[PDB]
Design a protein around this ligand. Sequence first.
Ligand SMILES: *[C@@H]1O[C@H](CO)[C@@H](O)[C@H](O)[C@H]1NC(C)=O
Ligand SMILES: *[C@@H]1O[C@H](CO)[C@@H](O)[C@H](O)[C@H]1NC(C)=O
Ligand SMILES: *[C@@H]1O[C@H](CO)[C@@H](O)[C@H](O)[C@H]1NC(C)=O
Lengths: 272, 220, 241, 214, 214
Amino acid sequence: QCVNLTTRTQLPPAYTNSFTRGVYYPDKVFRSSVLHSTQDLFLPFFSNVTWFHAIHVTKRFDNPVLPFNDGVYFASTEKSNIIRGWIFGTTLDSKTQSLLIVNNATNVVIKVCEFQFCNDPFLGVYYHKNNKSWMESEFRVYSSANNCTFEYVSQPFLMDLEGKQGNFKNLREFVFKNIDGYFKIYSKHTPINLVRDLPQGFSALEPLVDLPIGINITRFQTLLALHRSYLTPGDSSSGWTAGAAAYYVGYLQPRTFLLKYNENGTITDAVD
Amino acid sequence: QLQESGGGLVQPGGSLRLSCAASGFTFSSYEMNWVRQAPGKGLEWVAVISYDGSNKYYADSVKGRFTISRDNAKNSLYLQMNSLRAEDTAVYYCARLITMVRGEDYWGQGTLVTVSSASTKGPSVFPLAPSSKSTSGGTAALGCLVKDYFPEPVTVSWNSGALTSGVHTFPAVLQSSGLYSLSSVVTVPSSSLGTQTYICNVNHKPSNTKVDKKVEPKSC
Amino acid sequence: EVFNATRFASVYAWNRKRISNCVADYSVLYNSASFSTFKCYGVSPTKLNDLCFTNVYADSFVIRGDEVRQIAPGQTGKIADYNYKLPDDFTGCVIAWNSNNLDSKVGGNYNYLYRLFRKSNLKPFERDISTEIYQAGSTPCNGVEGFNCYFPLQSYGFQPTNGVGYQPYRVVVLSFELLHAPATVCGPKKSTNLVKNKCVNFNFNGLTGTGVLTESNKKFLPFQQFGRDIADTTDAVRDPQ
Amino acid sequence: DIQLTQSPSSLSASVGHRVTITCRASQSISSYLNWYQQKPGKAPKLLIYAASSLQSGVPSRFSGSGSGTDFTLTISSLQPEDFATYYCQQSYNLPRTFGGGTKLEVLGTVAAPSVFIFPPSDEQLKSGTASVVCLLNNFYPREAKVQWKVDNALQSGNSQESVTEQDSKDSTYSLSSTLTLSKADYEKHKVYACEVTHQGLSSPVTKSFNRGEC
Amino acid sequence: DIQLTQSPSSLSASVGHRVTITCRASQSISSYLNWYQQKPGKAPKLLIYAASSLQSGVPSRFSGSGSGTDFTLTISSLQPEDFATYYCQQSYNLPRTFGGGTKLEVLGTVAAPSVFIFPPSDEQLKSGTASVVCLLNNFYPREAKVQWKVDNALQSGNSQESVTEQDSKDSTYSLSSTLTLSKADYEKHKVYACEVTHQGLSSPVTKSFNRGEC
Ligand SMILES: *[C@@H]1O[C@H](CO)[C@@H](O)[C@H](O)[C@H]1NC(C)=O
Ligand SMILES: *[C@@H]1O[C@H](CO)[C@@H](O)[C@H](O)[C@H]1NC(C)=O
Ligand SMILES: *[C@@H]1O[C@H](CO)[C@@H](O)[C@H](O)[C@H]1NC(C)=O
């Protein structure tokens, strides 16, 4: 399936501050109107998070392989469902099992296989002007899935695949941990109006899902959708537009935090 | 199921390509054979090919001239025919011949080939017109002798089928021109020869030449 | 899906199905009166409902009724040698039943085959679908069948009239696999009723204690399962049913 | 090479007859000698997939035997479809090879005789030829002699014949045969007859066909 | 109640053969199925219990299998001491029930056919009865057939037989059988014979036993 892209320009690594983002409920315990101390893997307060983004203006599209370390805080700020998922694993080359999560435009999919991934994996919405619409048209994530050992697909849906004007409007925050052969996911959606950066303020990530997968994860790699159309050069490697989206990553570290629990048992504040 | 195809009528020194579609069984697992049969002769082995197609073998008549080949992905056998001879005038059957180990044999319906310099032409039509020359009580042969047509079949019948009682039809003779001929008959009472009109309903159907012709009993 | 499949494999080409991430009631199989054979090695069916595994493999095929004898540890003969071999430390169950009325045909059924000839015996759980002509003698048979050159697979000929040892039997082998990973397959777990307003000994979903249970005025977030107070004693719980 | 020798090239029988045909290979072939039935030009039906091994769904009345050079096909009691050709074929080595197939051609052995005799037709005169027709028709044998009388000589070499097989209801063949003569030959000649000598009758039978002279 | 069917009712073998016999239950009995051997006029000896467990001191060439409704006993390499009758028995519930045991009767299976037959003796005649002595002797296959010829009618219902047991060295049986007739019948008729339709030979054999007629 795979294609190496070209026309991507080269720029320095950007950074921004975490501003107390990225706490999550550490256990399934209700506590109310109390302050509680926990030692756990947390994103440190006021930390520098590496900033990655896709924009045309120039000609910037941005999904490198990154380390996983002890665990990852991840956030997307976007308006167009450009960030679509991730690869996690170690060798990423079918010589070991590895984990795919992807929102295909009608289906959330999770798989664990000996995937031969692309060196440059992506999705691609095409503006089919005969159909008068964008639609997902170019799944290019792996060549093969040589053995498999877990599978999941959600019940089907659709999404807008937006040529959206204005600033970023959705913030989606995630935390990923891999502990005792469980891959644990926490998340939070929030509506935003910020033009570029990661926003200040506070909200805890709630436990989303927890997957019983025995694998070693050491590296990860995000999946983004190209925009493609009759206005582009059309050519497989270069006839594409980046859309407009940004995402941020930071690493969890063993820290003691003091968490403030509401009368309803939500986290409402914390001290690093 | 097996279905041979690509047979036909061709000149000496020519080429032709047979094919054979396989259905309802795992063609890809087996040796697959060509066999042929010239008209009125015994069965003749032509060739065989291995399951994977890796090896090919032949009888000495077709050796070097022909090729046996297979498309397992298409469940299809082939015979390339080249430098055609009178030898190659046969029905060609495509088959899984069994040898010692129990399994289900398959043979196709067989595809016809004829090798001759001739051309598609109608029934040259010669009705048997029984008269003082030949009439004998309850016996008088009407009929036709029919000639000069290259594709093998001529249909023949009597008074447009109304004279079927006592019909007989006899194997064809290939003429030295490369055109076939045959004899066909009805044996009728001499007393009936004043009643019916008597037509010989020849049709060389590959020429589409219906030439149904009056028969003249009690002539001379 | 395994036991009521419409058509089974030929034994030389035996299917394998992998089971994971589900609740397995083995005793619902075992109590089904269907089976001519149900034999377990290293386990007992009643105890299987208490165990957990990373995967279970279900292997399945048709063989002749008298050959069922060979589907066991330490066995030998054309099935055990050339078609399907269990390891001699097998841990699992073999299930079989007569399928004469499904798998025989009045004209004889020849859809089912088995490997008649091989160079050597299979390894445990090895499989061999190769259709290369077996050289019994000295000539390289060169993909041609003849004097010392045999097609390696032979059909059974299941007529409905066959004597019982010659009738077709459907077979399933269950292998239980425990790895260094989460145990995704387990037997079902029994619940009693609730008993409010009495001193009882309790187990909510692995959380255990003794106490009096009563309906609470407080309400948790949808992912939370129990409450603790400022001293870290458990003051409330959510009923999993 | 290995060559095959069906001891009957042809047979005659009736329904209910136990029948055997035998085939000899030119050299030893162990048990590698298949047998087939063929109705004329139809796809050959495998009866026996070795010297002895009866094929799937083949009727129980058939059986094979043999070793080395010598082999049999048997039919325990003959039935109407068994009035057919039968082929041995060796399965031992290349080239795969077939016997001269035993034709059990006489659909009901019986004796019912017949004759007929027809000119080079008046409606054949226009051909630029005389094509005479001896026509012993509904005769029990395939066996009969035909003779000619054109300018009183008996013609030979310059002739053809073809026979319709033993009829299923009548248990009789019919023969057609033809001396053929160009415009030059047929107007040179003026006395004609054809003579049918089917030995199921007591005599040759003939008539004064006389092309241009009747 | 649970019914056990033992499939081969009798067997023939020779030393060093593997042998298998099978037992099948009218409902599932898990593994509750014993196997016994009995030699003539001895008590039964237990070989296998559960369905697979070899009993104390039994030779390792015996083995059992099954769990459910179908069970097998096998003998790995048969020996002269093994030719006996074998019974399965279910241990599952009351009444305890046995299969109709398989007889492994033919030691050293061979083929030698034989016949002989003998009259209703004069040294028997004094009884006021006739008793014919049909007598096929040292024949290999236990199976044989007998008929009669008194005034050349074939007698029926009026007969008995007994076979002397499978000969230890010959592996041949011998048979005695007797039509037996009153004074009135044995003088009313005058031609006699047994006819031995011995399957081991190509034909029946019969001899003029002629009570009151020699
Ligand atoms: C699957 O895993 C097995 C066992 O490690 C390996 O032999 C095989 O090459 C892998 N790939 C495929 C396509 O089976
Ligand atoms: C507690 O939850 C209820 C229901 O969502 C809400 O009305 C109330 O304002 C919450 N209280 C606080 C202090 O968050
Ligand atoms: C559990 O099952 C019962 C009985 O069908 C049903 O009433 C109840 O709503 C179910 N609860 C959950 C959490 O599925």
